[PDB]
Design a protein around this nucleic acid. Structure first.
Lengths: 696, 51, 772, 158, 50
RNA sequence: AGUAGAAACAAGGGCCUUUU
């Protein structure tokens, strides 16, 4: 491919290819005509067939492949020697046993038009033979020999098949004498436009074409314009060492409250043993209901904080009733209708039915979008971060598949490391929240798929396994089903992605709330529970979800992948520099700075620092939004500048203030952004004790 | 080694076997000799030895 | 059958409409392809979320209905819903079915007799598996790796082909009734097709899948990847489990797939024939082309033509390049200067003249290029990236791992750039005899200095000294190279940089059509030389196995065996069409006229004279026995005929037919003198040489109307002749005409008369009669 | 090729009721099963099926006038009970080249009282001890074995 | 399981090609080459699958 | 109410669109 010559070389001899190429170069015609000519030439060749005359001499003499002047010279020479009349036009081959030239033609159309035109042009002067790729023949004399015909038709058939396979069996590549001028059918309107879209100095495409086809380079004027533009710009250049980075200016106002749908630290759960038979969500929610604790609850009409407590109370009573009825279903009343946003969808009003009096009656101005409002730095985030680092009294919170066999040291190493990491991670608290989200979201998605237009009841639960003590005591520790609260959906008619289906969250806790943090919740005092007896609280709120958040939360087992990648990378790099197995040592020894306390820095091996990265990834998965996206996208510049500072690379920039502005623009009412920004400020501060390019 | 007898799985366990075309067998026929073509097998095996 | 009648009724109903009629009447059949796109067009953004949501339902799939009824598939076993009567909107002939329904079929359902055919369908992957199982793993180690990037092949494949040669193969094995005209690749590779056809015949199968798998079975997956260690497809297919940037799982994988042996054999043959043709002085071009077309070689079981393999491989060697150039085969933009490899990255230039004095005053012209140009260079276990500027080596960097290879690469690079004073004033050691013209063929000073270096190491040392030497400045100690090839020293060469880590080989998916001269030096639209005959080893002796050098000059046999072989060849050439040939006579059962052929009359003198009558009797006997009935084997008559020329006599036949040179043939068993197989029924092996029998008639062994195609040909269309099938095509008479359907939407007229002549000779000879 | 096409070709317009001989060597039969044979063939007295990938002889229809059979080069094993009911007038049989392990597979052939010659070559049974003698003692009516009678009397041409 | 064959060579299931003995070529290197000349070994081409 | 963003949802059509 890539050229018509290479194509023709597929089924033709390269010799005739070169011949037709030199010919088209002689006539300087479009090189798309290499094919027809080569074919004709090859036909002439296979028509000679090295036949001989009675005198043991060659019978036919090619005249097609030669130059035009030389061809005419030979033509006249033969017309004279054998005493023949000179022809007006040129021919392709001449025979001696008959002493009359012969012309060959070819065409694709199954009609005599080509032969009629040729016969009109030449009458009956010489012998003419026109073949067809589809097995036809038209002539003005006796037929050729049986071997020329059987051989010529076969070649043409093969060629036609090939071309049709290449989509080139058309007039373009196989034109007749007349249809040899292919051109874009330039109309009228297109030209009217082309002469109108021209740059300013020109007014017709012809002038532009004449200026471009003849354009010559004048480096001096180019350099002069370059310098001129280089003077009226004054591009600022700022080495960071001289122009340092100020701190980031966080917004001001109230504190950013809890946003995650479920509680993690303040969550209380009731546990039981799991039976393999009863494992669906609608069954366990009843099993826990029979023992009487779920029914022992009985909140009061006086809430500590929140709004619409009556609706919440009635909804809880209806939930208990439905559970008692063994049907996780709820009826449509005024309360649920208010909490589920059932009928609070706008009503449509066509303009064809509109008038000025209607507008003046009720103002119908353009909606004034109320963008989110700013917030302040949350002081409860570090508490959750430190709580999600400790064990949870159990493990196996997140389900995982099995390990396949192994045959070589590589798979052994991989399995060993993966087992270590999984055993370390499955015991934390963040893990139980991940499993909770996984299972609850799976159940909610199933329900939304099966029972839309119907208010349902779904639990907030998880499955785990008590830790393994020594062989002493009861061996083979058992499994456990834990329940943190209740969830409820509302007519998830997910007609389209990105939609919203309101839900409700009834959770159990034993810790009083804070106005700043637990702002959206509406807590009630329920009663007491054992461990001794302790009071009980009931956190309640409202929120929504969509297909995308469901699918992604269900797919919350990527943090493991990221953390394993980071850790294995570090360990393998440290092991290669010494050409020795340094993995366990790197996990038990290599220290990773993890925080400050009492104005001093703190450190713990990587084996215990994995949890920080895991929680970071989990939060990235939870609080993900456009704000966090922009932040994490714009912070890389600061890190690269920091690295340059560490290596004495004299970094520089054009306008850092604009970068700081862009960063601080996307910090609004999203706790993660604020926390990470404050921590980045603290980072640059602590490094200023060891590096430049940062202001205090 | 060469053979004209397909193997059995039990007795031939250490052997890897193939099928190498055919061969010929020659036997008397009155006062002349004849040849009757048969298949051919190839028995592959590894083993050690000592002095 | 009744189904056929139903299809006819459907066609009628559909033609009754107007739009369907207009579309099935207008245009050609290719429009079908177009119509195949305007229908059933629907995609999804995130099939993952959609799949989970969709499978959550209680009847999420579609499925056929009649297949379920016939399969007696119920709607429950112990209370689990399996399908429900209903209609999908798109198909309109399918019904929504449950995920549980699939499980039902596999566990208990409609059993089938056998399924081992799968192992053939996916042969490539079972081969992967077996290759894996035959590995002996080893320890694991950690360290840094020098992974160089480059283009390689990851799929081991035998008989790598093109795409046009496959679109046909997928038909003659599966869809023969819809087959097109026979292409040359088929007529040449008959046994291959027969093999691929023997397995996928009379089997219940989905054929599209088979075709796709065959495409994969004939596709070498070419990738641009990082690589370390040896380069073999057997490794690249699992490189992921051998080593990374920091680790290595040692394992030995040398004795598997026997690939590179074929390539080295091919290159050896190419070198041999190139030298042979070089022995000539004025026609080495045509001599080489003849040696090519007069040669063949075996691959596994099959015998392939050399010129066909050469156009399929991608070995960039100064031998393969020449051949592929003679045959007009396009190739990549890769150079070759002796043993080294080179590739241009950027720059340009043009030839220029200069001269040097060999001894005292002896002017000798040598050329060199003008403007700055970058080049990558690759010698054994060594890489380099350098630049040339107006007959000088401007700069160079190296990332190899050996001192000797480094020095040799550097020297060959310096030569390639004509850098140094030697090109300004050659040394005394060289003389006019060593200059050029072993027998008249000149030699540029470049290769002169090349061999002068390869002769003695001290020439190389002096050449390196020709390059500037200085004291190793501070800091650059590591990026420096001494004279021995040491990564650091106190004094090092000029304008040199070293480093650990090979250079990333460049890449370009380009092709060029080059040519060559009468002196075997290829040119590429410029005065640049990509290959020659001075950049290859001088000579060496090798005994090639399973090869056919069917050419006089390239032959070692004596006049006796050669005469026997040529007699057999002539006797086979009478296997064509037309009366007076053996096929027509067999059809007429004229077993007698065969005895009087002229070819047997020419081979008779070779027969043992003291027992020629007895053998003759036996031969004639066999012939009559085979001819009278019709149950014959064409591979035995062609063997025994030469003995039927004489008169029968009486005596004891003792099993063997001797010639006059103590060489015999036996009627029924293959021997060194005459062998053949039912697998490849299109070949005859005599004294190792191979002979291609035409395909005019098909005896008991041959298969499926692929053995008559060389007896037919196209002719002027005649509507009077009848239209028949591809199976009755055997019952026609030699010289008759018949209409027929070919491939799709195409009808033609054929005649059972062959044409042995080709176009090469006719084009080549006729073009030579025009340059006068 | 295929036994179907082979047969239809051998039947050059001839009815399958007037033939006395047939040959199908160097053909193919799916699943090693006969295909195209019927009871229509009545006057047939000879048959030859060799190297056709055959493995069993259950499908063969009823042929009385048949008096000679050839099944060499195949891999038949076990089915020799069918020969008695379908072809009780058989005299010459050949099985060299097939899968034959023990004698219990051969015992049914005793019922072919019209049997004269048998041909077993290249089979496992031949590699036993006292095989010619034990076979003769099993099939007394038989006289020729692989072309040699008791005392190794070479049989004539025909 | 049953005890398998153990000896190095084959006794009963063996097979052998034959040829005339030349006292001038009575050595292994010569006998093998002679046996190979007639090309009966080269015909031994085991298929891939065992 | 709520979600989230710099606009959209908070069903739409004429009855339809359950097990780690």
């Amino acid at each position: 491919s890539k050229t018509f010559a290479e194509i023709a070389e597929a089924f033709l001899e390269p010799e005739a290819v070169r011949i037709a190429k030199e010919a088209v170069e002689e006539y300087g015609d479009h090189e798309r005509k290499i094919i027809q000519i080569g074919i004709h030439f090859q036909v002439c060749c296979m028509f000679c067939d090295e036949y001989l005359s009675t005198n043991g001499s060659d019978r036919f003499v090619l005249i097609e492949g030669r130059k035009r002047g030389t061809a005419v010279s030979l033509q006249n020479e033969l017309c004279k020697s054998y005493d023949l009349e000179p022809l007006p036009f040129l021919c392709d081959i001449f025979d001696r046993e008959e002493k009359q030239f012969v012309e060959i033609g070819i065409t694709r159309k199954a009609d005599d038009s080509y032969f009629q035109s040729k016969f009109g042009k030449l009458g009956n002067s010489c012998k003419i033979f026109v073949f067809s790729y589809d097995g036809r023949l038209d002539k003005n004399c006796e037929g050729p020999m049986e071997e020329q015909k059987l051989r010529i038709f076969s070649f043409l058939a093969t060629a036609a098949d090939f071309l049709r396979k290449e989509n080139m069996f058309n007039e373009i590549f196989l034109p007749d004498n007349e249809e040899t001028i292919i051109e874009m059918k330039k109309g009228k309107t297109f030209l009217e436009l082309r002469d109108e879209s021209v740059p300013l100095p020109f007014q017709t495409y012809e002038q532009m074409k004449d200026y471009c086809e003849k354009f010559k380079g004048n480096p001096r004027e180019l350099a002069s314009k370059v310098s001129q533009m280089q003077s009226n710009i004054k591009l600022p250049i700022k080495h960071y060492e001289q122009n340092k980075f100020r701190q980031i200016r966080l917004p001001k106002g109230p504190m950013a409250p809890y946003t995650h749908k479920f509680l993690m630290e303040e969550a209380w759960m009731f546990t039981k043993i799991s039976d393999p038979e009863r494992s669906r969500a609608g069954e366990i929610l009843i099993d826990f209901f029979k023992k009487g604790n779920l029914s022992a609850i009985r909140p009061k009409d006086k809430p500590l904080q929140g709004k619409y407590p009556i609706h919440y109370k009635n909804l809880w009573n209806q939930i208990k009733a439905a559970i008692a009825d063994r049907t996780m279903v709820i009826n449509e009343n005024d309360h649920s209708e208010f909490l589920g946003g059932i009928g609070r969808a706008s009503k449509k009003i066509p303009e064809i039915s509109l008038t000025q009096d209607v507008i003046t009656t009720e103002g119908l101005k353009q909606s004034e979008n109320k963008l989110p409002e700013p917030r302040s730095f949350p002081r409860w985030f570090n508490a959750e971060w430190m709580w999600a680092i400790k064990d949870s009294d159990l493990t196996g919170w997140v389900p995982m598949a099995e390990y396949p066999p192994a045959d070589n040291e590589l798979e052994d190493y991989a399995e060993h490391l993966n087992k270590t990491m999984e055993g370390v991670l499955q015991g934390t608290n963040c893990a139980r929240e991940m499993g909770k989200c996984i299972l609850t979201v799976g159940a909610l998605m199933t329900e939304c798929r099966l029972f839309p237009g119907k208010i349902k009841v779904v639990p907030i639960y998880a499955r785990s396994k008590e830790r393994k003590s020594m062989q002493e005591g009861l061996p083979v520790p058992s499994e456990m089903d834990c329940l943190f609260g209740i969830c409820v959906k509302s007519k998830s008619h997910l007609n389209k992605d990105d939609g919203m289906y309101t839900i409700i969250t009834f959770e159990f806790s034993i810790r009083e709330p804070n106005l700043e943090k637990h702002q959206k919740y509406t807590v009630f005092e329920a009663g007491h529970t054992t461990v001794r007896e302790v009071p009980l609280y009931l956190y309640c709120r409202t929120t929504a979800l969509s297909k995308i958040k469901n699918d992604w939360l269900s797919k919350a087992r990527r943090c493991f992948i990221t953390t394993m990648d980071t850790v294995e990378t570090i360990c393998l790099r440290e092991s290669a520099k010494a050409e020795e197995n340094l993995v366990e040592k790197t996990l038990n020894e290599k220290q990773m700075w993890i925080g400050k306390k009492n104005g001093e820095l703190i450190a713990q091996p990587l084996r215990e620092a994995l949890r920080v990265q895991l929680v970071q990834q989990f939060y990235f998965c939870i609080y993900n939004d456009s704000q966090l996206e922009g932040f994490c996208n714009e912070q890389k510049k600061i890190l690269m500048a920091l690295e340059g500072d560490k290596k004495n690379k004299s970094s520089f920039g054009f306008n850092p203030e604009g970068l700081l502005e862009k960063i601080e623009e996307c910090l609004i009412n999203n706790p993660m952004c604020l926390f990470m920004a404050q921590r980045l400020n603290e980072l640059v501060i602590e490094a200023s004790k060891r590096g430049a390019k940062f202001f205090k | 080694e060469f053979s004209i007898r397909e193997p059995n799985l039990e007795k031939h366990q250490k052997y890897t076997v193939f099928e190498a075309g055919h061969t010929t067998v020659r036997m008397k026929k009155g006062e002349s000799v004849i040849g009757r073509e048969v298949p051919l097998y190839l028995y592959c095996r590894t083993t050690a030895l000592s002095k | 059958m009744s189904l056929l009648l139903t299809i006819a009724k459907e066609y009628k109903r559909l033609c009754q409409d107007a739009k369907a009629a207009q579309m099935m009447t207008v245009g050609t059949v290719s429009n079908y392809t177009t119509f195949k796109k305007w229908t059933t067009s629907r995609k999804e953004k995130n099939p993952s979320l959609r799949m989970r949501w969709a499978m959550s339902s209680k009847f999420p799939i579609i499925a056929n209905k009649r297949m379920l009824e016939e399969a007696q598939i119920p709607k429950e076993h112990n209370n689990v819903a399996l399908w429900e009567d209903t209609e999908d909107v798109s198909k309109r002939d399918h019904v929504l079915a449950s995920a549980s329904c699939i499980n039902y079929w596999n566990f208990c359902g409609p059993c089938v007799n056998n399924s081992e055919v799968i192992k053939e369908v996916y042969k490539s992957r079972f081969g992967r598996l077996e290759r894996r199982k035959e590995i002996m793993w080893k320890e694991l180690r950690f360290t840094l790796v020098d992974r160089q990037r480059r283009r390689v092949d990851t799929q081991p494949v035998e008989q790598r082909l093109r795409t046009g040669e496959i679109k046909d193969l997928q038909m003659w094995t599966l869809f023969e009734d819809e087959a097109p005209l026979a292409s040359k690749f088929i007529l040449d590779n008959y046994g291959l097709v027969k093999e691929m056809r023997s397995k996928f015949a009379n089997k219940p199968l989905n054929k599209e899948v088979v075709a796709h798998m065959l495409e994969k079975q004939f596709n070498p997956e070419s990738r641009f990847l990082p690589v370390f260690g040896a380069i073999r497809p057997e490794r690249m297919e699992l490189i992921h489990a051998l080593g990374g940037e920091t680790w290595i799982q040692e394992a030995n994988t040398a004795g598997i797939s026997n690939v590179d042996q074929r390539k080295n054999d091919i290159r050896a043959v190419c070198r041999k024939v190139c030298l042979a043709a070089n022995a000539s002085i004025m026609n080495a071009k045509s001599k080489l082309v003849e040696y090519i077309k007069s040669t063949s070689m075996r691959i596994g079981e099959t015998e392939r033509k050399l010129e066909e393999l050469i156009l399929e491989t991608d070995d960039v060697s100064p031998e393969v390049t020449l051949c592929k150039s003679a045959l007009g085969g396009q190739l990549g933009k890769t150079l070759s200067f002796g043993p080294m490899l080179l590739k241009k990255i950027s720059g340009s230039g043009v030839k220029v003249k200069d001269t040097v004095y060999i001894q005292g005053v002896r002017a000798v012209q040598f050329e060199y290029w003008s403007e700055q140009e970058e080049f990558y260079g690759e010698y054994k276990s060594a890489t380099a990236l350098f630049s040339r500027k107006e007959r000088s080596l401007e700069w160079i960097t190296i990332g190899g791992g050996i001192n000797e290879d480094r020095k040799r690469l550097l020297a060959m690079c310096m030569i390639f750039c004509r850098d140094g004073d030697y090109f300004k004033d050659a040394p005394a050691t060289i003389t006019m005899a060593d200059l050029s013209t072993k027998l008249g063929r000149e030699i540029p000073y470049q290769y002169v200095m090349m061999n002068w270096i390869q002769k003695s190491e001290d020439n190389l040392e002096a050449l390196l000294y020709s390059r500037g030497i200085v004291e190793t400045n501070p800091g650059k100690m590591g990026s420096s190279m001494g004279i021995d090839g040491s990564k650091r020293a106190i004094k090092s060469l000029r304008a040199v940089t070293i480093q650990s880590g090979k250079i990333d080989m460049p890449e370009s998916k380009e092709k060029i059509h080059l040519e060559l001269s009468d002196n075997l030096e290829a040119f590429d639209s410029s005065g640049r030389i990509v290959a020659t005959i001075l950049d290859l080893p001088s000579d060496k002796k090798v005994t090639f196995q399973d090869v056919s050098f069917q050419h006089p000059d390239l032959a070692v046999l004596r006049d006796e065996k050669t005469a026997i072989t040529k007699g057999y060849e002539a006797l086979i050439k009478r296997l064509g069409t037309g009366d007076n040939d053996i096929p027509s006579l067999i059809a007429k059962k004229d077993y007698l006229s065969l005895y009087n052929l002229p070819e047997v009359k020419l081979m008779a003198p070779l027969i043992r004279p003291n027992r020629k009558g007895v053998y003759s009797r036996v031969a004639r006997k066999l012939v009559s026995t085979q001819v009278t009935t019709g149950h014959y084997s064409l591979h035995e008559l062609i063997k025994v005929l030469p003995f039927t020329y004489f008169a029968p006599k009486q005596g004891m036949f003792e099993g063997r037919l001797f010639f006059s040179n103590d060489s015999f043939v036996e009627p029924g068993v293959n021997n060194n003198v005459f062998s053949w197989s039912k697998a490849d029924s299109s070949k005859i092996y005599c004294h190792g040489i191979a002979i291609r029998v035409p395909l005019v008639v098909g005896d008991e062994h041959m298969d499926t109307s692929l053995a008559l195609l060389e007896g037919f040909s196209v002719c002027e269309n005649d509507p009077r002749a009848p239209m028949v099938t591809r199976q009755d095509l055997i019952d026609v008479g030699f010289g008759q005409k018949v209409r027929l359907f070919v491939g799709q939407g195409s009808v033609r007229t054929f005649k059972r008369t062959a044409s042995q002549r080709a176009a090469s000779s006719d084009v080549n000879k006729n073009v030579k009669k025009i340059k006068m | 090729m295929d036994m179907k096409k082979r047969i239809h070709l051998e039947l050059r317009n001839r009815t399958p009721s007037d033939v006395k001989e047939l040959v199908l060597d160097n053909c193919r039969s799916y699943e090693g099963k006969i295909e195209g044979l019927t009871d229509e063939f009545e006057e047939l007295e000879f048959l030859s099926t060799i190297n056709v990938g055959l493995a069993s002889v259950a499908n063969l229809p009823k042929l009385n006038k048949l008096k000679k059979l050839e099944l060499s080069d195949n891999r038949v094993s076990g089915g020799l009970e069918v020969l008695a009911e379908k072809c009780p007038n058989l005299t010459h049989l050949n099985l060299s080249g097939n899968k034959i392990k023990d004698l219990g597979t051969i015992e049914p052939l005793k019922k072919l009282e019209n049997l004269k010659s048998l041909d077993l070559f290249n089979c496992e049974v031949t590699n036993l001890n006292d095989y010619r003698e034990n076979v003769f003692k099993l099939l007394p009516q038989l006289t020729y074995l692989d072309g040699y009678d008791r005392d190794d009397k070479e049989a004539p041409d025909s």
